[PDB]
Amino acid sequence: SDQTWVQCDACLKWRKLPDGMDQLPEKWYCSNNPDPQFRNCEVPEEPED
C-alpha cells in the first residue's frame, strides 16, 4: 500500500492522510487535518521516504 497525501490549498504543503480517507472536500487545508500535529500551515512538510 502507498501513502496518500493531500495538498493544503492555502500554504501548498503536502500532508499525509490516513489510509482509506477516500472522500475529501473540494478544497482542503491544514486546519482540517485529522492529525493535530500537522493542523497548522506553519508546521513544515514531512519528508518523503
Partner: peptide, 11 residues
C-alpha cells in the same frame, strides 16, 4: 482536493 500517492516501504 489535490492528492498524490508515494511509496511506503513499511507496507
Amino acid at each position: 482536493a489535490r492528492t498524490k500517492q508515494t511509496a511506503r516501504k513499511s507496507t
